[PDB]
Design a protein around this motif. Structure first.
Motif, PDB file in Angstrom:
ATOM      1  N   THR A  15       0.813  -1.218   0.000  1.00 19.19           N
ATOM      2  CA  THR A  15       0.000   0.000   0.000  1.00 19.19           C
ATOM      3  C   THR A  15       0.849   1.272   0.000  1.00 19.19           C
ATOM      4  OG1 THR A  15      -0.216   0.084   2.423  1.00 19.19           O
ATOM      5  CG2 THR A  15      -1.926  -1.143   1.182  1.00 19.19           C
ATOM      6  N   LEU A  16       0.214   2.382  -0.386  1.00 14.10           N
ATOM      7  CA  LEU A  16       0.819   3.705  -0.357  1.00 14.10           C
ATOM      8  C   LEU A  16      -0.177   4.628   0.327  1.00 14.10           C
ATOM      9  CD1 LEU A  16       2.363   4.102  -3.931  1.00 14.10           C
ATOM     10  CD2 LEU A  16       3.610   3.706  -1.756  1.00 14.10           C
ATOM     11  N   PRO A  17       0.315   5.673   1.015  1.00 16.03           N
ATOM     12  CA  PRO A  17      -0.610   6.514   1.764  1.00 16.03           C
ATOM     13  C   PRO A  17      -1.515   7.398   0.915  1.00 16.03           C
ATOM     14  CG  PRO A  17       1.583   7.476   1.827  1.00 16.03           C
ATOM     15  CD  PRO A  17       1.723   6.099   1.191  1.00 16.03           C
ATOM     16  N   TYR A  18      -2.627   7.803   1.519  1.00 15.56           N
ATOM     17  CA  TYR A  18      -3.483   8.833   0.957  1.00 15.56           C
ATOM     18  C   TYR A  18      -2.761  10.176   1.003  1.00 15.56           C
ATOM     19  CZ  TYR A  18      -7.156  12.401   0.776  1.00 15.56           C
ATOM     20  OH  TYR A  18      -7.887  13.515   0.483  1.00 15.56           O
ATOM     21  N   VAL A  19      -2.803  10.898  -0.112  1.00 17.78           N
ATOM     22  CA  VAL A  19      -2.343  12.295  -0.178  1.00 17.78           C
ATOM     23  C   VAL A  19      -3.399  13.109  -0.911  1.00 17.78           C
ATOM     24  CG1 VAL A  19      -0.533  13.934  -0.919  1.00 17.78           C
ATOM     25  CG2 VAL A  19       0.075  11.535  -0.283  1.00 17.78           C
ATOM     26  N   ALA A  20      -3.912  14.151  -0.269  1.00 13.90           N
ATOM     27  CA  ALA A  20      -4.933  14.968  -0.900  1.00 13.90           C
ATOM     28  C   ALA A  20      -4.406  15.598  -2.195  1.00 13.90           C
ATOM     29  CB  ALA A  20      -5.443  16.040   0.056  1.00 13.90           C
ATOM     30  N   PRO A  21      -5.266  15.720  -3.219  1.00 15.01           N
ATOM     31  CA  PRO A  21      -4.812  16.407  -4.427  1.00 15.01           C
ATOM     32  C   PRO A  21      -4.598  17.899  -4.177  1.00 15.01           C
ATOM     33  CG  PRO A  21      -7.198  16.012  -4.532  1.00 15.01           C
ATOM     34  CD  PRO A  21      -6.669  15.264  -3.318  1.00 15.01           C
ATOM     35  N   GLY A  22      -3.541  18.439  -4.774  1.00 16.71           N
ATOM     36  CA  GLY A  22      -3.292  19.884  -4.778  1.00 16.71           C
ATOM     37  C   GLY A  22      -4.085  20.603  -5.859  1.00 16.71           C
ATOM     38  N   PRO A  31     -15.010   8.166  -8.776  1.00 23.33           N
ATOM     39  CA  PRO A  31     -14.496   7.978  -7.395  1.00 23.33           C
ATOM     40  C   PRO A  31     -13.401   6.903  -7.320  1.00 23.33           C
ATOM     41  CG  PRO A  31     -16.646   6.945  -7.616  1.00 23.33           C
ATOM     42  CD  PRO A  31     -16.409   7.692  -8.921  1.00 23.33           C
ATOM     43  N   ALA A  32     -13.398   5.946  -8.246  1.00 26.31           N
ATOM     44  CA  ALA A  32     -12.369   4.889  -8.243  1.00 26.31           C
ATOM     45  C   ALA A  32     -11.033   5.480  -8.721  1.00 26.31           C
ATOM     46  CB  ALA A  32     -12.795   3.722  -9.125  1.00 26.31           C
ATOM     47  N   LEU A  33     -11.031   6.122  -9.892  1.00 18.45           N
ATOM     48  CA  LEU A  33      -9.781   6.719 -10.396  1.00 18.45           C
ATOM     49  C   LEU A  33      -9.216   7.741  -9.416  1.00 18.45           C
ATOM     50  CD1 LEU A  33     -10.824   7.136 -14.126  1.00 18.45           C
ATOM     51  CD2 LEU A  33      -9.242   5.443 -13.207  1.00 18.45           C
ATOM     52  N   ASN A  34     -10.110   8.520  -8.799  1.00 21.77           N
ATOM     53  CA  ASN A  34      -9.652   9.522  -7.846  1.00 21.77           C
ATOM     54  C   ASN A  34      -9.001   8.922  -6.626  1.00 21.77           C
ATOM     55  OD1 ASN A  34     -10.500  11.427  -9.607  1.00 21.77           O
ATOM     56  ND2 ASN A  34     -12.298  12.107  -8.444  1.00 21.77           N
ATOM     57  N   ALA A  35      -9.593   7.853  -6.098  1.00 19.45           N
ATOM     58  CA  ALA A  35      -8.966   7.152  -4.969  1.00 19.45           C
ATOM     59  C   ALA A  35      -7.599   6.585  -5.360  1.00 19.45           C
ATOM     60  CB  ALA A  35      -9.854   6.043  -4.497  1.00 19.45           C
ATOM     61  N   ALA A  37      -5.495   7.672  -7.745  1.00 22.05           N
ATOM     62  CA  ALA A  37      -4.560   8.783  -7.911  1.00 22.05           C
ATOM     63  C   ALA A  37      -4.183   9.380  -6.534  1.00 22.05           C
ATOM     64  CB  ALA A  37      -5.171   9.843  -8.828  1.00 22.05           C
ATOM     65  N   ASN A  38      -5.149   9.468  -5.619  1.00 21.87           N
ATOM     66  CA  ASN A  38      -4.872  10.005  -4.267  1.00 21.87           C
ATOM     67  C   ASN A  38      -3.820   9.154  -3.552  1.00 21.87           C
ATOM     68  OD1 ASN A  38      -6.597  12.147  -4.613  1.00 21.87           O
ATOM     69  ND2 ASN A  38      -8.300  11.245  -3.438  1.00 21.87           N
ATOM     70  N   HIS A  39      -3.733   7.876  -3.927  1.00 20.61           N
ATOM     71  CA  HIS A  39      -2.752   6.964  -3.337  1.00 20.61           C
ATOM     72  C   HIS A  39      -1.470   6.809  -4.148  1.00 20.61           C
ATOM     73  CE1 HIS A  39      -4.839   5.412   0.269  1.00 20.61           C
ATOM     74  NE2 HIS A  39      -5.900   5.858  -0.385  1.00 20.61           N
ATOM     75  N   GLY A  40      -1.419   7.437  -5.314  1.00 15.27           N
ATOM     76  CA  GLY A  40      -0.282   7.297  -6.227  1.00 15.27           C
ATOM     77  C   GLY A  40      -0.189   5.953  -6.932  1.00 15.27           C
ATOM     78  N   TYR A  41      -1.267   5.158  -6.904  1.00 14.89           N
ATOM     79  CA  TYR A  41      -1.292   3.898  -7.670  1.00 14.89           C
ATOM     80  C   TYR A  41      -1.419   4.173  -9.171  1.00 14.89           C
ATOM     81  CZ  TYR A  41      -2.322   1.905  -3.050  1.00 14.89           C
ATOM     82  OH  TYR A  41      -2.264   1.557  -1.723  1.00 14.89           O
ATOM     83  N   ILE A  42      -2.049   5.292  -9.487  1.00 15.93           N
ATOM     84  CA  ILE A  42      -1.874   5.980 -10.769  1.00 15.93           C
ATOM     85  C   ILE A  42      -1.316   7.362 -10.385  1.00 15.93           C
ATOM     86  CG2 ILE A  42      -3.760   4.583 -11.731  1.00 15.93           C
ATOM     87  CD1 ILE A  42      -5.580   6.967 -11.742  1.00 15.93           C
ATOM     88  N   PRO A  43      -0.732   8.098 -11.343  1.00 20.05           N
ATOM     89  CA  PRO A  43      -0.019   9.324 -10.948  1.00 20.05           C
ATOM     90  C   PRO A  43      -0.835  10.275 -10.064  1.00 20.05           C
ATOM     91  CG  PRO A  43       0.438   8.860 -13.232  1.00 20.05           C
ATOM     92  CD  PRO A  43      -0.600   7.824 -12.788  1.00 20.05           C
ATOM     93  N   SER A 219     -10.969   7.569  -0.880  1.00 21.53           N
ATOM     94  CA  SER A 219      -9.953   6.675  -0.343  1.00 21.53           C
ATOM     95  C   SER A 219     -10.702   5.406   0.082  1.00 21.53           C
ATOM     96  CB  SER A 219      -9.202   7.329   0.832  1.00 21.53           C
ATOM     97  OG  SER A 219      -8.048   6.564   1.115  1.00 21.53           O
ATOM     98  N   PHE A 220      -9.985   4.402   0.590  1.00 21.06           N
ATOM     99  CA  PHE A 220     -10.589   3.084   0.805  1.00 21.06           C
ATOM    100  C   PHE A 220     -11.016   2.868   2.244  1.00 21.06           C
ATOM    101  CE2 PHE A 220      -7.559   2.891  -2.735  1.00 21.06           C
ATOM    102  CZ  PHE A 220      -8.482   2.700  -3.764  1.00 21.06           C
ATOM    103  N   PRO A 221     -12.229   2.303   2.442  1.00 15.11           N
ATOM    104  CA  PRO A 221     -12.814   2.118   3.779  1.00 15.11           C
ATOM    105  C   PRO A 221     -12.234   0.960   4.615  1.00 15.11           C
ATOM    106  CG  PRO A 221     -14.378   1.351   2.089  1.00 15.11           C
ATOM    107  CD  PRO A 221     -13.151   1.880   1.356  1.00 15.11           C
TER     108      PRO A 221
END
Ligand code: HEM
Ligand SMILES: *[C@@H]1O[C@H](CO)[C@@H](O[C@@H]2O[C@H](CO)[C@@H](O)[C@H](O)[C@H]2NC(C)=O)[C@H](O)[C@H]1NC(C)=O
Ligand SMILES: *[C@@H]1O[C@H](CO)[C@@H](O[C@@H]2O[C@H](CO)[C@@H](O)[C@H](O)[C@H]2NC(C)=O)[C@H](O)[C@H]1NC(C)=O
Ligand SMILES: *[C@H]1O[C@H](CO)[C@@H](O)[C@H](O)[C@@H]1O[C@H]1O[C@H](CO)[C@@H](O)[C@H](O)[C@@H]1O
Ligand SMILES: *[C@@H]1O[C@H](CO)[C@@H](O)[C@H](O)[C@H]1NC(C)=O
Ligand SMILES: *[C@H]1O[C@H](CO)[C@@H](O)[C@H](O)[C@@H]1O
Ligand SMILES: *[C@H]1O[C@H](CO)[C@@H](O)[C@H](O)[C@@H]1O
Ligand SMILES: *[C@H]1O[C@H](CO)[C@@H](O)[C@H](O)[C@@H]1O
Ligand SMILES: *[C@H]1O[C@H](CO)[C@@H](O)[C@H](O)[C@@H]1O
Ligand SMILES: *[C@H]1O[C@H](CO)[C@@H](O)[C@H](O)[C@@H]1O
Ligand SMILES: *[C@H]1O[C@H](CO)[C@@H](O)[C@H](O)[C@@H]1O
Ligand SMILES: *[C@H]1O[C@H](CO)[C@@H](O)[C@H](O)[C@@H]1O
Ligand SMILES: *[C@H]1O[C@H](CO)[C@@H](O)[C@H](O)[C@@H]1O
Ligand SMILES: *[C@H]1O[C@H](CO)[C@@H](O)[C@H](O)[C@@H]1O
Ligand SMILES: *[C@H]1O[C@H](CO)[C@@H](O)[C@H](O)[C@@H]1O
Ligand SMILES: *[C@H]1O[C@H](CO)[C@@H](O)[C@H](O)[C@@H]1O
Ligand SMILES: *[C@H]1O[C@H](CO)[C@@H](O)[C@H](O)[C@@H]1O
Ligand SMILES: [Mn+2]
Length: 299
Positions: A15-22, A31-35, A37-43, A219-221
């Motif tokens: 896993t990688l941490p949640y980071v809010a988008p700037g 909501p899936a793509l956004n989650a 990207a928020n984790h850096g699993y996609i850019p 992000s994931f529950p």
């Protein structure tokens, strides 16, 4: 979550941490793509995304197999070429272009306003991309007081959203999109149906708290006992769920439904746009992130 936290273990061991988008980061109406990207699993910046990056991100971090997103990938790239005016090859230019209206993005979303919802004039448009708490509440209200919901409930939800959008959208704008929306209905069952119940594959029930967490927080529950489905969900589950939603009997019929709303839907197929057609201008709003509360790296 932080790699050492073990929060995803043994379902997701990297896993990688949640980071809010700037403010300059690109986000999607998804909501899936956004989650992801928020984790850096996609850019994290939401730009320059290959098909394989998406396939791996969904499979390894959300328990969604490649088959599930095959048509979505095709359609994302069709929309990329349509919006940008040239072939995007295997690098999706950004996530934001996916909010091109009357294309992949569609009317009567569960948690987003429509492109011309409530506008005073015909040339006007609004943010049809970012999570809208009020819109999402209109979906949740249908299942108020419940912890789980079934196919029939989801059918009522999408009907309420169709009714609301048809009434609130600028005259002539509203365009029903049962095939795309109900793939997304299937996606909801695939991701956040309660796999801890004994008959999940036959009659999956969405955990409302999981759904709310995923949509509101992008992000994931995990904190609510969610994990990626194992084995990964496949396309058959999704289109079966989609069909079951539309096949479910309606106990409350809202007014102002578009013609043919009640009944089966067409199979989703690749999008296509005329080479002459100029795309609608994209909403330019900064990306949404949760603030009530803001999320930490493990949330
Ligand atoms: C490459 C893969 C994907 C692409 C390009 C994509 C793209 C999109 C787009 C453009 C929308 C906006 C439709 C609208 O609501 O107006 C959307 C919505 C949505 N997506 Fe994704 N999607 C992908 C995969 C997934 C997956 C795998 C899931 C969950 C398993 C998911 C869950 C959803 C849901 C539930 C909505 C509806 C949101 C709402 O109605 O408020 N998506 N997606
Ligand atoms: C969005 O995420 C936050 C952070 O995880 C949620 O607030 C926490 O929820 C967990 C359980 O999931 C509780 O144990 C914590 O007490 C909460 N922390 C804070 C800071 O309030 C929040 O509920 C999520 N939003 C939705 C709608 O699910
Ligand atoms: C995502 O990419 C799209 C497509 O390139 C961007 O939308 C275009 O942005 C340029 C400004 O750089 C405008 O001239 C065009 O009018 C826009 N196209 C449309 C159809 O609106 C968009 O700005 C990018 N978004 C982010 C956040 O990166
Ligand atoms: C997006 O930006 C455009 C040009 O900068 C504006 O014309 C649009 O109205 C839209 O603005 C909205 O979002 C931006 C965030 O980038 C805000 O700066 C605006 O206040 C507005 O909410
Ligand atoms: C995570 O690691 C454990 C221990 O090696 C293993 O049993 C499990 O299969 C792993 N999960 C995945 C998704 O690889
Ligand atoms: C979900 O999938 C089913 C089966 O393909 C369709 O009937 C429905 O319209 C939606 O696309
Ligand atoms: C959902 O629907 C698709 C066709 O749209 C099937 O291929 C799948 O098996 C499932 O029934
Ligand atoms: C297709 O698959 C879905 C999800 O597993 C079932 O709920 C449905 O009854 C059909 O078998
Ligand atoms: C699509 O599939 C669902 C689930 O099997 C059915 O309920 C529906 O009638 C349609 O054939
Ligand atoms: C399908 O069945 C429901 C009950 O489950 C009815 O309320 C509806 O009128 C339709 O016949
Ligand atoms: C019939 O039941 C549905 C859920 O499927 C409700 O939305 C409606 O209010 C009616 O009681
Ligand atoms: C019955 O229930 C549905 C879904 O909640 C509404 O949309 C309808 O107006 C009626 O109250
Ligand atoms: C509300 O009304 C419609 C017909 O207008 C039915 O199809 C539905 O089952 C519900 O009773
Ligand atoms: C709007 O229409 C629906 C059914 O089409 C009714 O249930 C409601 O009472 C209102 O007249
Ligand atoms: C309302 O109009 C549409 C035509 O697009 C039909 O599909 C429906 O059966 C109803 O007549
Ligand atoms: C998909 O279909 C459209 C029809 O408008 C064509 O314009 C496009 O070139 C592609 O064949
Ligand atoms: C979001 O930012 C706020 C700052 O007040 C914190 O309370 C929270 O932990 C999260 O990092
Ligand atoms: Mn939409």
């Amino acid at each position: 979550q932080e790699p050492g936290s073990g929060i995803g273990y043994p379902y997701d061991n990297n896993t990688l941490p949640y980071v809010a988008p700037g403010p300059t980061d690109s986000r999607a109406p998804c909501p899936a793509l956004n989650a992801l990207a928020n984790h850096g699993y996609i850019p994290h910046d939401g730009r320059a995304i290959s098909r394989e990056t998406l396939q791996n991100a969904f499979l390894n971090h959300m328990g969604i197999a490649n088959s599930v997103i095959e048509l979505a990938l095709t359609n994302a790239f069709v929309v990329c070429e349509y919006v940008t005016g040239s072939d995007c090859g295997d690098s999706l230019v950004n996530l934001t272009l996916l909010a091109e209206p009357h294309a992949f993005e569609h009317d009567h979303s569960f948690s987003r306003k429509d492109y011309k919802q409530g506008v005073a004039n015909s040339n006007d448009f609004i943010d049809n991309r970012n999570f809208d708490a009020e819109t999402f509440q209109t979906s949740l209200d249908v299942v108020a007081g419940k912890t789980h919901f079934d196919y029939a409930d989801m059918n009522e939800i999408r009907l309420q959203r169709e009714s609301l959008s048809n009434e609130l959208d600028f005259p002539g704008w509203f365009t029903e999109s049962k095939p795309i929306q109900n793939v997304e209905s299937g996606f909801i069952f695939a991701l956040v149906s309660d796999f801890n119940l004994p008959d999940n594959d036959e009659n999956p029930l969405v955990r409302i708290d999981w759904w709310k967490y995923w949509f509101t927080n992008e992000s994931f529950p995990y904190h609510l006992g969610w994990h990626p489905p194992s084995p990964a969900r496949e396309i058959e589950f999704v289109t079966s769920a989609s069909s079951a939603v539309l096949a479910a009997s309606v106990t409350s019929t809202p007014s102002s439904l578009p013609s043919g709303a009640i009944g089966p839907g067409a199979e989703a197929v690749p999008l296509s746009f005329a080479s002459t057609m100029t795309p609608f201008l994209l909403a330019t709003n900064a990306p949404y992130y949760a603030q009530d509360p803001t999320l930490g790296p493990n949330d």
